[PDB]
């Protein structure tokens, strides 16, 4: 019974009320204005005015990559188009050249280097490979583009994101891993060296501060002293372990106004304030409290042995037979140029870490930490740190408390 327009109109997405029951709708008023405003002219324009204009639709060219085959999990197909997002505009092939042909724009951005050598991206399953065989290649011998060419079952039926996975993680499978471990070293070894060696100095030049700080040593000596004077016969001792440090703070005085560590501090500064240098000398130790020293090493054993392995590969396998190297894979033209000096610094760090660890384990053996006990091996520094600050704190408390003990002294 309602009046209606000739062309589509701008819809009024409202939320209808269902039951009319005892509303305001139901008295049919709605129906009067209905025709009324139609004959009275009105709707005629309301029509013309809110005429919903047409809606264009395009894109397509990248839409259809939908219809084409895909053996790759949305995630992956996605996290390709994510990092290979700068190569957007390049065709499925243009791009692969730029990659095998190790450009200076590709190798520069690690985001892409790292991606392409991601275990999760490299490793192809039989269940996977199979799906890609009817489109693969061998490059055994092949020294030109047009040669190989046995498409057999055509690759164009795959989604763009799918194709790359093919011409790269599949078709150059055999060596892609190492090819990448190489190109990486190429692109990384530099900083990825300075970075460690420095990480290594922040140790060596704190382990140093500890070596020699007759100061520190003395302070302990002063504690051992007061210790023995306090402890009883059965508890006397020609020396103690660091594990003692943290329980200095508990030993309160009588009037719980003093933390034993206070006296110890007060005592130095007012009989030997020629020692409160340890609280200056030894900071470099704080500059490495959380350093996983047992994994700093290993990161270094990783550095060298990684190179010592892009090496092994250039010769005895993987990266030798320039035959499988898809004609263009300009990796060697890029690896070798640097493989030399790289390895140099690979043996450098080694030396350094030799020179360092052994040293370190020595300072530890000193206070009694067994260079061979995961724990002290690292939880070492922390106790020196902990002590210091527990001390740099007792110092404060004491140096301030000693202020208040001047005014309530003068006034």
């Amino acid at each position: 019974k309602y009046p209606r327009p000739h062309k589509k109109l701008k819809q009024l997405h409202w939320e209808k009320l269902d039951c009319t029951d005892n509303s305001i709708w139901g008295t049919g008023k709605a129906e009067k204005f209905a025709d009324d405003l139609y004959e009275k002219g009105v709707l005629a324009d309301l029509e013309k005015a809110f005429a919903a204009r047409e809606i264009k639709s395009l894109a397509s060219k990248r839409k259809e990559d939908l219809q084409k085959i895909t053996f790759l999990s949305r995630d992956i197909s996605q996290q390709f188009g994510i990092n290979l997002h700068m190569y957007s505009s390049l065709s499925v092939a243009d791009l692969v050249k730029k990659i095998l042909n190790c450009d200076r724009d590709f190798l520069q951005t690690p985001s892409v280097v790292e991606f392409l050598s991601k275990s999760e991206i490299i490793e192809v399953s039989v269940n996977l490979a199979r799906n890609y065989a009817p489109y693969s290649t061998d490059w055994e011998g092949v020294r030109n583009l047009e040669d190989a060419k046995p498409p057999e079952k055509d690759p164009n039926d795959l989604q763009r994101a799918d194709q790359i996975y093919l011409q790269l993680m599949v078709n150059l499978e055999s060596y892609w891993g190492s090819r990448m471990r190489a190109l990486t070293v190429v692109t990384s070894y530099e900083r990825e060296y300075n970075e460690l060696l420095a990480k290594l100095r922040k140790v060596d030049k704190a382990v140093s501060a500890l070596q020699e700080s007759d100061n520190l040593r003395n302070v302990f000596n002063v504690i051992l002293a007061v210790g023995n004077f306090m402890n009883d016969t059965s508890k006397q001792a020609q020396g103690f372990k660091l594990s003692t440090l943290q329980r200095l703070t508990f030993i309160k005085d009588t009037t719980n106004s003093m933390t034993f560590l206070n006296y110890v501090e007060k005592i130095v500064r007012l009989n030997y304030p020629s020692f409160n240098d340890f609280l200056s000398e030894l900071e470099p130790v704080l500059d490495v409290v959380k350093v996983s020293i047992e994994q700093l090493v290993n990161d270094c054993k990783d550095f060298s042995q990684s190179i010592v392995n892009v090496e092994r590969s250039v010769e005895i396998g993987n990266l030798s037979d320039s035959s499988k190297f898809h004609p263009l894979d300009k990796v060697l033209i890029k690896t070798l140029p640097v493989l030399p000096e790289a390895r140099k610094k690979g043996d450098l760090l080694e030396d350094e870490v030799k020179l360092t660890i052994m040293e370190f384990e020595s300072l530890m053996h000193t206070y009694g930490e067994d260079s061979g006990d995961k724990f002290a091996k690292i939880s070492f520094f922390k106790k020196f740190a902990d002590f210091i600050n527990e001390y740099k704190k007792a110092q404060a408390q004491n140096l301030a408390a000693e202020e208040e003990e001047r005014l309530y002294i003068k006034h």
Partner: protein, 357 residues
């Protein structure tokens, strides 16, 4: 032939252009001029008569009359494109109340015959151009600073940190101190071109208990700026003083737990099983995160609070001050994903409530 625009709406600076691009082929501030309509940049040089609005407060749109103005401006002006022939990517803050995702979209479809459009979360899009698709982000432009746990493009609703300190928040504590060093900065223009100190200079040490002692025990950290008036201003231990606020909420009373501290507690909010990579993947986003020297300043503090056996890579892109917008041109130039669009069609049939599903 085909094309697609990407518009990242923000508290302080709109930022938008086209698809598969390097960055926005247009940018200005979220500001609108109306008398006691002229939006965008020619809106300072029009102060007094027109009172000024900020359609967006802390990430969330608050004035739709005006907001609509901007989106209008944005196109026809700093883009010269006229809707219809264009699918649009809009952005929205983490936790943007459903209400507005509707009021947002409506505005489009209804007001600009936009054929299609999707509304993307601000963090997330950020982390997309960082390659990853997982791990905690720190979007932190002008109005608001959020801490967003991610994981395969999927943010964790209960573990997002929203903090209300950021851009103009800081641009503010500066002006505070500059006159506390007797200066001409109180007036307006003598402020606009003073957030600017913050942008073009203003770094962040590594510790003040070790660098505030390089002008309070030295005189080498100064520098100067050539004010539009000529009269040059020499800045002292300033560049790094304010940004301290992020880490140092206090500086403006802000009883807030700090930016680095939050990335911490935040993560401790979502499950443990992802944490390794959360830590292993701290992408950071625009504005207040890109002051020189905060990249590794973070890194320090975080690696500090964080455990001593934890991977802690702390990212910070070419210019994340476009991170979110950039990711924006990606998840759309990236074609394939096209099945996340909402055609005016679909809209016409269901309407608002569709922008959601």
């Amino acid at each position: 032939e085909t094309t697609a625009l990407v518009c990242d709406n923000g508290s302080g600076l709109v930022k938008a252009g086209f698809a598969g691009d390097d960055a926005p082929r247009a940018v200005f501030p979220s500001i609108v001029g109306r008398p006691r309509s002229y939006v965008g940049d020619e809106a300072q040089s029009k102060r007094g008569i027109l009172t000024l609005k900020y359609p967006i407060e802390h990430g969330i749109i608050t004035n739709w009359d005006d907001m609509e103005k901007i989106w209008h401006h944005t196109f026809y002006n700093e883009l010269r494109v006229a809707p219809e022939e264009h699918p649009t990517l809009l952005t929205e803050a983490p936790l943007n109340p459903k209400a507005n995702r509707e009021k947002m979209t409506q505005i489009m479809f209804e007001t600009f015959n936009v054929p299609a459009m999707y509304v993307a979360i601000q963090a997330v899009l950020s982390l997309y151009a960082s390659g990853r698709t997982t791990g905690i982000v720190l979007d932190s432009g002008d109005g608001v600073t959020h801490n967003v746990p991610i994981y395969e493009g999927y943010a964790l609703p209960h573990a997002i940190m929203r903090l209300d300190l950021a851009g103009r928040d800081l641009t503010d504590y500066l002006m505070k101190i500059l006159t506390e060093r007797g200066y001409s900065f109180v007036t307006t223009a003598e402020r606009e071109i003073v957030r600017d100190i913050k942008e073009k200079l203003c770094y962040v040490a590594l510790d003040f208990e070790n660098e505030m002692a390089t002008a309070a025990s030295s005189s080498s950290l100064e520098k100067s700026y050539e004010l539009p008036d000529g009269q040059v201003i020499t800045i002292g231990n300033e560049r790094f003083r304010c940004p301290e606020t992020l880490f140092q909420p206090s500086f403006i009373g802000m009883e807030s737990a700090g930016i680095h501290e939050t990335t911490y507690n935040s993560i401790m909010k979502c499950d443990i099983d992802i944490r390794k990579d959360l830590y292993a993947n701290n992408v950071m986003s625009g504005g207040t995160t890109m002051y020189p020297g905060i990249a590794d300043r973070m890194q320090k503090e975080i690696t500090a609070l964080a455990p001593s056996t934890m991977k802690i890579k702390i990212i910070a892109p070419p210019e994340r001050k476009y991170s979110v917008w950039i990711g924006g041109s990606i998840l759309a130039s990236l074609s394939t994903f096209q099945q996340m669009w909402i055609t005016k069609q679909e809209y016409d049939e269901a309407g608002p409530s569709i922008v959601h599903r």
